[PDB]
Amino acid sequence: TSENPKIGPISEVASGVKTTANGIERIPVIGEIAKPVTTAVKWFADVVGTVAAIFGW
Amino acid sequence: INIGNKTNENVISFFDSTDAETQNHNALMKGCGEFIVNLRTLLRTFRTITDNWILQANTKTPITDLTNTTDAQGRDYMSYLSYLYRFYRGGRRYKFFNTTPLKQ
Amino acid sequence: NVHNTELASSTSENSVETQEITTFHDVETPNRIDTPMAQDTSSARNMDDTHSIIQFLQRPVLIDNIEIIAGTTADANKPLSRYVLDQQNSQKYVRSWTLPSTVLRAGGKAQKLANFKYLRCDVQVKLVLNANPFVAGRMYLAYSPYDDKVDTARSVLQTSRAGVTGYPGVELDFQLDNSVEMTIPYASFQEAYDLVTGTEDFVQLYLFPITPVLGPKSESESSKVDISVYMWLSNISLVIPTYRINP
Amino acid sequence: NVHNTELASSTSENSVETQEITTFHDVETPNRIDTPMAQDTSSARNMDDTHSIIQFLQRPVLIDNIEIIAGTTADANKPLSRYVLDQQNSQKYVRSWTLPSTVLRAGGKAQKLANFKYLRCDVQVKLVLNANPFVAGRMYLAYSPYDDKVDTARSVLQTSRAGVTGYPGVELDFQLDNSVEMTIPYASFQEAYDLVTGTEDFVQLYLFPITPVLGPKSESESSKVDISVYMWLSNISLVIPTYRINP
Amino acid sequence: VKLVLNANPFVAGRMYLAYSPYDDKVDTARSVLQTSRAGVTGYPGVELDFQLDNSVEMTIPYASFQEAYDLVTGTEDFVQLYLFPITPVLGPKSESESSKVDISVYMWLSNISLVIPTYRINP
Amino acid sequence: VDEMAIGYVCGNPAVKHVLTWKTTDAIQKPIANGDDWGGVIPVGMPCYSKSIRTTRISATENRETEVMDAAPCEYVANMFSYWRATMCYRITVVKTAFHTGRLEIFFEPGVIPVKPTVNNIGPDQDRLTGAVAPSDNNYKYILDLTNDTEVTIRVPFVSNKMFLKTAGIYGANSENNWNFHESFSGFLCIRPVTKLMAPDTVSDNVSIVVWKWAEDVVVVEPKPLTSGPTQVYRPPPTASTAVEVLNVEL
Amino acid sequence: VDEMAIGYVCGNPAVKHVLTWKTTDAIQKPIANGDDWGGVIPVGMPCYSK
Amino acid sequence: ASTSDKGYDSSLMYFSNTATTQIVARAGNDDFTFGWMIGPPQLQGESRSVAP
């Protein structure tokens, strides 16, 4: 949905908040990136979880 | 017309032209092609802190023999933006471009 | 069709064309070259708008800046006398302003109604007053139409205190209203005011002291009044184009 | 309520009031005296209307009046050379006009855009030609943007006949079109044209002879061309107020 | 923190109450006392106008890098609180009447957690 | 709160002027008492005021050094090359309930009337009096000082350029002053309409405190436009001692 | 507005007295300083001062 | 510039068998941020070394 003649452009992006990005409105920090203590950081997700790669296998 | 200082601030805006957030977006489609919002993203771009860091052979050298000299200067972005703030958090990256007259 | 040029075309026998004043018979219609698809220039339309010519003339301008130190052995602190027995004992005034010939000259309004002939206007006036809370006083801002035209006995400066304040005016108390406004209408007997060939001093605007300036008797501290005057026009009609302008 | 006067009222603590540029805090609202029921003045609104300030600037003005007698030992009858081998053999032209600094000075347009800062405009141009039916000839009216700015080899006067007529222009045949029109766009790299502190000669307008004036060889009767030039502005935006004006 | 101000209505002036965390810890060029007027007032603070607000309040957060503040074995001067004059005290020139400002300071704690029992206390 | 957004950093106000408006100062003349630049505030995100520290290398040579007071919006624009922002100002009068006066704040776009010195640039108050520079056509605000104190002015971005330079006062003098004029596009000027009316039992001075911040900030290029690097001035211990001089050779 | 009605003409106010009340003047005594007729205003439409 | 508590977070150590000379360019990683804003210090301009 973005006009670009390169096939997939770069660095696949996540989502954030609902505001204007400058022009003072006290942007919350917890809303910007969406990784709390949960199954969303990949190293805590590998032991919650308990995949085989945390055991060396 | 009583006596006593007061309040009730009068925000006045000169030049009733057009809402500025439309004019900024229309000015960066023609002069930049990029829109720098946050100063945090300038901490992820590598800026050179020195140009000639001379060392000796077989000597374990900490980066705090260089970083402690160049934190005070404010040349790159991690030492210029650090004067606005009091804390930090997170790791750091480095690149070491070689400029040695090497032997084969 | 070709690009970036025009040729001889031999078009129709028409185009009596009007550029708002000028026409332009043109035995055949003139062949036009222009920008083929216009996307013109910079963002001057996004900065402000615009202005027009009867919206330029509605801008306030500084005209005078009065200061009254009390005092005073001078004349502007001398209040309205109760009677006028002869013409050498006229009513004393702080300041006079002939109109509309003061506001047309000042503030660059002379350029934006040059090369016109007739005018309607209402001279809006705003005074700005500012004194410390230990100084009292009252003033009166009346206007006398045709005051320098009529017979001397029909003037405002040749009548009593109860006759001066019977003119259209407004009180200016030092501790109740630091600003007064006043609309002075189209004060001319003829139709629209003639801008070329003549100064036409129609209405005079005076500022009278009812009471003297009531300051404390402590000298070397300057009890003071410090009035400022703003004027502009309203209900403006500016019609007939000429090539002349008055000296 | 009383008539023909105002008093001290002690009204509310408001009226940040705007006269389109000027505000005017006014700690309390100023007490107004005005015409109690307005029926103002003469019939200046019935004569014409009005005009505005971007409608004053759209008026055509005389700028130049060319006359070509053929003849001629002079330079304006010398046509376009096929080549330019050096800068001392440049293309000869009838007349040049720098823009927009010619049309802003002429016809009293300088007064009606004094005390502004920025401008957009399209310089409309109309030529008027008039010769007797026994005289033929053809001319070309090209305009070269930044002609007195660029390097000499990038000019219109330093190129061939086939390069001069490759500019945006129009033919002016003496016996097919007695008038041509041309719109010259906003020819500036920056946003709106700066009126204060600088002459900014952006686009040059030239008039070239393709063919010489083809008159009969009977002297003492004056075969003649007699061109006239009219210019005015269009797509006008005039925005930011200043107090300065250029010398 | 709460300041209490009290001056007569014939005296004007303005002050600024900024706080600088780690001000006596950092390098000298990173202090509040070694920067310009436009840099001092860029700190977190509040105006104290003599004739608009006779009292200002201010919450200074948990300004420590470590977890909960160590009460035993160490003075840990973490945040410094300063009071700067923007304008001088604008009193009349009549001496022997004492144009005067007379500020008072009140402080207390909030969001308190006090956890681990010991037998020791610092000297 | 995201304490690194350009909105949040540049929206931190800082005091650029503390003026002194006496009871002796004339009307329609800009208030020039105490601080440099007087009642002439260049509207713009970069920095316009600098001090010059002079120390000795030898008995026949002096080493000068330009020191610049930066607001937290002027400190961010120095990182970049071009700027574009809606500048905000809050003009506050420090007075009693008995000081009354009126004050004019008008905006004049374009080139600032300045006196280029051999080492610095100061303004020109001789060309901003009521005679030579009438404020009848400018956008102006006439502040009343009988009860009211503050006024917030939001000057948008008006220029013939899409962006203005962020060079500012850096290396500006008589020999070089072009980049100074192309950085601001305007100046606020504070002149009295009515002279300061005050009794004898109050002070003969008021102070005009001007706060400065910015809104709707966009910047262009992540390289400073200055000749040297961005260098933080570390104040030396003694007046006789020297500073750090950063080179440009690679 | 009908500027000749007796209502409109007589409803135009005018200043008949500007007195001066000093800090020395006694109580319960009419204010007689400056103008003639003092603090005694004859209630009536005709004129009383000449 | 904290207290005498030292060595509370990691850093880098450099080693090379030969006497090298380099261009060091640092940046923060994907988790690096500052915080707890204060006001700015001063800046420094040119140094002309004038004739008197």
Residue numbers in the entry:
A (entry chain D): 13 to 69
B (entry chain A): 1 to 104
C (entry chain B), D (entry chain B): 11 to 257
E (entry chain B): 135 to 257
F (entry chain C): 51 to 300
G (entry chain C): 51 to 100
H (entry chain A): 157 to 208
What did the paper state?
Israeli acute bee paralysis virus (IAPV) is a member of the Aparavirus genus of the family Dicistroviridae. Viruses of the family Dicistroviridae have nonenveloped icosahedral capsids protecting linear, single-stranded, positive-sense RNA genomes of 8,500 to 10,200 nucleotides. The major capsid proteins VP1 to VP3 of IAPV form the capsid shell with pseudo-T=3 icosahedral symmetry, whereas VP4 is a small protein attached to the inner surface of the capsid. Here we present a high-resolution cryo-EM analysis of IAPV virions induced to release their genomes in vitro.
Cryo-EM images of the full particles were used to calculate a single-particle reconstruction to a resolution of 3.3 Å. Residues 13 to 69 of VP4, among the 69 residues in the polypeptide, could be modeled in the cryo-EM map. The positioning of residue 69 from the C terminus of VP4 close to residues Asp186-Asp187-Phe188 of VP1 verifies the previous speculation that these residues form a putative catalytic site responsible for the cleavage of dicistrovirus VP0 into VP4 and VP3 subunits. The structure of the heated IAPV virion is nearly identical to that of the native virus, with a root mean square deviation (RMSD) of C-α atoms from the icosahedral asymmetric units of 0.76 Å. Whereas the capsid structures of the native and heated (63°C) IAPV virions were almost identical, there were differences in the distribution of the genomic RNA inside the particles. In heated IAPV virions, the RNA forms a 20-Å-thick shell with a higher density that tightly follows the inner face of the capsid and a sphere in the center of the virion with a radius of 80 Å.
